[PDB]
Design a protein around this ligand. Structure first.
Ligand SMILES: [Mg+2]
Ligand SMILES: [Zn+2]
Ligand SMILES: [Zn+2]
Lengths: 96, 38, 72, 222, 175, 45, 154, 162
RNA sequence: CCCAUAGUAGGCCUAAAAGCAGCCACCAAUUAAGAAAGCGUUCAAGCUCAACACCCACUACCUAAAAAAUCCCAAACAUAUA
């Protein structure tokens, strides 16, 4: 997941993840949170932060992100894998 | 590019590619390692 | 000319009186159960200890290093 | 997790004195006053002596015939001394000193007037003869590497094999030679004289079994 | 980021190693040396100790004082000033278990050991390994035994240093 | 023998049956059994 | 001429591979897992953050200051122990990178208050005396009053 | 199968992940003991490059292919399908398996030159001007080197160099 | 496909060679990493690999091609049964 570190993460404002521990379709959002909270991607900017929200009766692995342009991007990883959402977020943060 | 019959990687960033009928060794870190198959 | 040369003139008793040296009674007994000269091999440790596996891993690392000397 | 196999311990192989190779001179201690002809039968066919190992476990197996002069021996000994470990590796020469005289005449001279003068000396090397033997307390990758590095420089074909590798290659060779589909072996046709083939063949082919030709060696003839 | 540097306490002149790197980094050097000197003036021996510094993007350096090295303590406890080129065939000196135990219990308060659940057995094993890799040798607890050991080791080490200096002079003469 | 289904407290819908059984066993009397309970509780603590 | 087989070996069903003999590493791992599961009563599985070792030793020192320990185990040696024992309802919580906490005696308040300082340290939950709970479960259980008054209120 | 669906509504891109349906294999295999999808239907060395139905079941609608862990082929069977699919897109087969592009199909340069059994790329090979003498003539390759073990009915090997 | 803290500038001529200038032993802590397996280093920084943590396709049929002078030379067909 070094592409997200080589690209950049400055214009982003606040990101967060929500999932359930007992579900069997929460590994994608789990590894996404693990890759997005590394060392290079976290030290490339200090004006942003992450929120790790863990609920029991959520029953949905939704990941909502937004940057400084006032937009909003929410991606629920119910069936998507990790690389797909990673490259989607990369393209969305590079194009805007 | 340099004409070389036996191609090999001289460092780490060298990646092998197959183009226009010849194997070429491109590298972005050390451009001196560009080889051409004869 | 600068160099850290602070060799104290110790003879036979200046190494126990200059510093607050404690007798053997106050020191615990488990501090003398360590190794002395030669280290530990592989046939002296039981396979149910971490030291044997660490020594085997170090030997494997040494073998890999001795093998990967000509390839690129 | 993965398993951790024990490393092969080296405690029964002691390095002797002088681990490096000795010096090879050009002419011997006494010159040969009698000029000998260039007998080509000293490199044609399989090798007789210096076939198996003796002390070490790694040696260069020759796959062809040829002559080696002083420069080749110097290059080989220099490469060995510069690409080895004196505290872990040691090699012993397997081929003797070059002693076969070669007569060369003057440049731009008419045909005649007897033979020329003896210049350099070479040594006969047959196929399957171990050129150099090296042992020690090392493994198989590095030694095979810096032995094939020299074998590729040799004029004739040569490879870096050991004991287990030689055993395996002989095993697969005999397996391929004992499991032949077509029932027309070169030996059966050469020995029994079939279709009058003995007219264009050679009497030395009865022992070579079609595996040798002049100085080369084809391991795929069967 | 961080810059690893091991300089002397009371001797920190602006230039060698700690010079071009500090110049290309973007921070001052004379102020850093003055701060290091005013922080190390508390030491009445001038013991060389490592220094871990950190630089922030707004060009501002910080100094974190830790514990000195182990080779200096081992050489001070043994009594020899320079290490030997061989181990086993030419021992530099002997150090009892009490000295290395005191050194370990004094050093086990730096930023590397106080921030980890490490017991005394681990640190004494580490210091024994360091002493074995240095050139000295450990021993149970030998009072009169280590007294006689020092009595003979002074003479044998003087003879070894004399013969080593003679060999070095011969090698310097063959030139 | 494994464990329970691991419920939560944000949606109170289920409760362990052992607690209900104990409460039904201890909440059906007058005051003498309450005094006996207090006595057996203060005997130790 | 090589022998031409009637049936290619890649087409016929290959014989099963011989099972390897279990080494002592996994045996010691299972033994120490059972040991730390029998004596300790409070565990908390949390997602391991791929951070630097500096902050890692910092948080290790901050945790061990309150007289607690920490030890993790790989999933390959942990899934059989979780599927053969009584903790069969915790197998979907060990499908990736995670960190297991081994802390003796109930001290959930201090550890929660010291881990909530960073907003990137989530936890899937754990069991509190054979009672599996989640993160919200832990944060509402840490607000319970003291043990003596709850014991004596009856 | 699974597809991605992105919708824009109020400056909020909604990227969904809906899983659709997909067919399965017939519940009556001729050779159930086979380990490969080709071997289970007795298609070992029985197919050619003209079979557009067999090649369309292991490729992508945009021209891509599928790995061995998804399909189920071995090492020698996966390379044969990879070579036969390249001989179809050049001969005009599979018109619906074209790669996506914005608006690049505007200038029609070279016209549709009909071809078949194309082994190498057209605009890459060099024209043979010398062709050698006679014995060591440089012939033009054709067919595929991995399609030599197929069943023949002409009492002659497949001549790939003529 | 990912991944890297520390006892230290382990012992010594040269000013020092701090993991690649030479010697015998090449220690030692938590899960797990070599007093150093491959580039850039007067003395320090920059990059990977082996070892945890993590999933775990083949992780490799070993190497075997060349260009002179009037102008290159017959053409063609991998798929109706030796
Ligand atoms: Mg480094
Ligand atoms: Zn390069
Ligand atoms: Zn098959």
């Amino acid at each position: 997941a070094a592409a997200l570190a080589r690209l950049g993460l400055r214009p982003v404002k606040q990101v967060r993840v929500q999932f359930c521990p007992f579900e069997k379709n929460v590994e994608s959002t789990r590894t996404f949170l693990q890759t997005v909270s590394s060392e290079k991607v976290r030290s490339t900017n200090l004006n942003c932060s992450v929120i790790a929200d863990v609920r029991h009766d959520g029953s949905e692995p939704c990941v909502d992100v937004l940057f400084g342009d006032g937009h909003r991007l929410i991606m629920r990883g119910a069936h998507l894998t990790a690389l797909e959402m990673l490259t989607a977020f990369a393209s969305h943060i590079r194009a805007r | 590019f340099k004409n070389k019959t036996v191609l090999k990687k001289r460092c780490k960033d060298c990646y092998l590619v197959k183009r226009r009928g010849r194997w070429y060794v491109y590298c972005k870190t050390h451009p001196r390692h560009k080889q051409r198959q004869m | 000319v600068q160099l850290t040369t602070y060799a104290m003139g110790v003879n036979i008793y200046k190494e126990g009186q200059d510093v607050p040296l404690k007798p053997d009674a106050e020191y615990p007994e488990w501090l003398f159960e360590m190794n002395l000269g030669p280290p530990k091999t592989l046939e002296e440790l039981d396979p149910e200890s971490r030291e044997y596996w660490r020594r085997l891993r170090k030997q494997n690392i040494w073998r890999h290093n001795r093998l990967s000397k000509n390839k690129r | 997790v993965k398993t951790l196999l024990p490393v092969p311990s080296f405690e029964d192989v002691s390095i002797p004195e002088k681990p490096k190779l000795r010096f090879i001179e050009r002419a011997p201690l006494v010159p040969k006053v009698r000029r000998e002809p260039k007998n080509l039968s000293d490199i044609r066919g399989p090798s007789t002596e210096a076939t198996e190992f003796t002390e070490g476990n790694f040696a260069i197996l020759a796959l062809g015939g040829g002559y080696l002069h002083w420069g080749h021996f110097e290059m080989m000994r220099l490469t060995i001394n510069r690409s080895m470990d004196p505290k872990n590796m040691f090699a012993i020469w397997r081929v003797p000193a070059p002693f076969k005289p070669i007569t060369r005449k003057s440049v731009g001279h008419r045909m005649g007037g007897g033979k020329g003068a003896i210049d350099h000396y070479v040594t006969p090397v047959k196929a399957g003869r171990l050129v150099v033997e090296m042992g020690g307390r090392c493994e198989f990758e590095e030694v095979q590497g810096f032995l094939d590095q020299v074998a590729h420089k040799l004029p004739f074909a040569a490879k870096a094999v050991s004991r287990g590798t030689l055993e395996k290659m002989r095993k697969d060779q005999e397996e391929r030679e004992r499991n032949n589909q077509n029932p027309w072996t070169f030996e059966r046709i050469a020995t029994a004289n079939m279709l009058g083939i003995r007219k264009v063949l050679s009497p030395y082919d009865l022992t070579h079994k079609g595996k040798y030709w002049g100085k080369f060696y084809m391991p795929k003839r069967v | 980021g961080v810059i690893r540097a091991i300089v002397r306490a009371g001797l920190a002149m602006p230039g060698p190693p700690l010079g071009p790197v500090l110049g290309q980094r973007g921070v001052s050097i004379n102020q850093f040396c003055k701060e290091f000197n005013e922080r190390t003036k508390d030491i009445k021996e001038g013991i060389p100790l490592p220094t871990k510094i950190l630089v922030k993007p707004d060009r501002t350096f910080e100094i974190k004082i830790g514990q000195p090295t182990v080779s200096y303590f081992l050489k001070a406890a043994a009594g020899i000033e320079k290490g030997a080129r061989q181990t086993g065939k030419e021992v530099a000196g002997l150090v009892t278990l009490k000295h290395v135990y005191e050194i370990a219990r004094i050093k086990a308060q730096d930023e590397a050991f106080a921030l980890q659940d490490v017991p005394l057995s681990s640190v004494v094993r580490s210091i024994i390994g360091s002493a074995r890799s240095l050139g000295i040798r450990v021993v149970k607890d030998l009072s009169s035994e280590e007294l006689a050991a020092f009595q003979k080791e002074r003479a044998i080490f003087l003879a070894a240093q004399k013969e080593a200096d003679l060999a070095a002079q011969e090698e310097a003469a063959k030139k | 023998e494994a464990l329970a289904g691991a419920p939560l407290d944000n949606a109170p819908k289920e409760y362990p049956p052992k607690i209900q059984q104990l409460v039904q066993d201890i909440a059906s009397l007058t005051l003498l059994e309450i005094s006996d309970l207090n006595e057996l509780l203060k005997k130790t603590l | 001429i090589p022998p031409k087989p009637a049936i290619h070996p890649s087409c016929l069903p290959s014989p099963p591979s011989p099972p390897q003999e279990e080494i002592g590493l996994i045996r010691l791992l299972r033994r120490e897992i059972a040991a730390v599961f029998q004596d300790n009563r409070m565990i908390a599985v949390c997602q391991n953050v791929a951070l630097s070792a500096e902050d890692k030793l910092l948080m290790r020192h901050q945790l061990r200051k309150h007289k607690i320990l920490m030890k993790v185990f790989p999933n390959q040696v942990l899934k059989p122990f979780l599927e053969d024992s009584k903790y069969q309802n915790l197998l979907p919580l060990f499908v990736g990178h995670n960190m297991l906490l081994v802390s003796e005696e109930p001290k959930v308040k201090e550890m929660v208050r010291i881990l909530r300082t960073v907003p990137f340290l989530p936890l899937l939950g754990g069991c509190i005396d054979d009672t599996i709970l989640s993160r919200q479960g832990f944060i509402n259980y840490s607000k319970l009053p003291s043990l003596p008054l709850v014991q004596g209120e009856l | 199968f699974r597809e991605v669906v992105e919708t824009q509504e109020g400056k909020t891109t909604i990227i969904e992940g809906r899983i659709t349906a997909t067919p399965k294999e017939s519940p009556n295999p001729p050779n159930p003991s086979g380990q490969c999808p080709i071997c289970r239907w007795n298609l070992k060395h029985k197919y050619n490059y003209d079979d557009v139905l067999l090649l369309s079941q292991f490729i992508r609608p945009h021209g891509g292919m599928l790995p061995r862990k998804i399909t189920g082929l071995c090492q020698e069977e996966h390379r044969k399908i990879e070579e036969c699919v390249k001989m179809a897109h050049r001969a005009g087969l599979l018109p619906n398996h074209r790669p996506r592009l914005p608006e690049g199909v505007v200038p029609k340069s070279k016209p549709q030159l009909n071809r078949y059994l194309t082994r190498w790329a057209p605009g890459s090979v060099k024209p043979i001007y010398k062709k050698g003498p006679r014995w060591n003539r440089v012939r033009m390759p054709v067919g595929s080197p991995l399609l030599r073990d197929n069943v023949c009915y002409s009492r002659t090997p497949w001549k790939l160099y003529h």
